[PDB]
Amino acid sequence: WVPPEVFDLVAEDKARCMSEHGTTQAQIDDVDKGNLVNEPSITCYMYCLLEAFSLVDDEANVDEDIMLGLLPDQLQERAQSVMGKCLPTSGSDNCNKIYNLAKCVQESAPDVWFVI
C-alpha cells in the first residue's frame, strides 16, 4: 500500500539513521518480514526514522494525529484500533519502547506491517 514516492522522501534520513546506529539492510528486511529482535542497531534505527518524520517525540511518545495523517483511508481505523491496544509506548529507553511497539503492532496487524 506504500506509495513509491515515500522511498525517495525518506532516503536521506534512512542513510543517516543506518550510519548512526550500525544498521544493515538485512536487519531492516528481517523486521520487514516479521522478525524483530531487541538489538539497538535495528531498534534505534526504527526510533530514528520515526523521529525524523515527527511521528515520535524525545521520549518515544507517538503522535497519533500525524501518524493517521500519513496512512491511507483503508487503514485509517484499523490503525486507530491498533493504536488503542499498543499505545502508550513503554520500555527502558527510546529504542526499547519502539521495539515493544513494533512487537505489538506486527502481532496486531501482520499483513499490513512493514518498515522502510
Ligand X SMILES: CCCCCCCCCCCCCCCC(=O)O
> Rule CB under 5 A: which residues touch Cl ion?
61-62, 87-89
Nearest-approach distance from CB 65 to Cl ion, in angstroms? 12
Residue 98 binding ligand X, by CB under 6 A? yes
3-state secondary structure the chain: CCCCHHHHHHHHHHHHHHHHHCCCHHHHHHHHCCCCCCCHHHHHHHHHHHHHCCCECCCCCECHHHHHHHCCHHHHHHHHHHHHHHCCCCCCCHHHHHHHHHHHHHHHCCCCCCCC
Residue 79 binding ligand X, by CB under 6 A? no
Half-sphere exposure of residue 89: CA atoms within 13 angstroms, side-chain side: 25
Residue 46 binding ligand X, by CB under 6 A? yes
**Given candidates 50, 60, 83, 95, which one binds ligand X under the rule CB under 6 A?**
50
Residue 6 binding ligand X, by CB under 6 A? yes
Residue 116 binding ligand X, by CB under 6 A? yes
**C-beta neighbour count of 22 within 10 angstroms:** 13
- Residue 34, contacted partner among Cl ion, ligand X, none, CB below 5-8 A by kind: none
- Residue 36, contacted partner among ligand X, Cl ion, none, CB below 5-8 A by kind: none
Per CB under 6 A, residues contacting ligand X are 6, 9-10, 46, 49-50, 53, 70, 98, 101-102, 105, 115-116
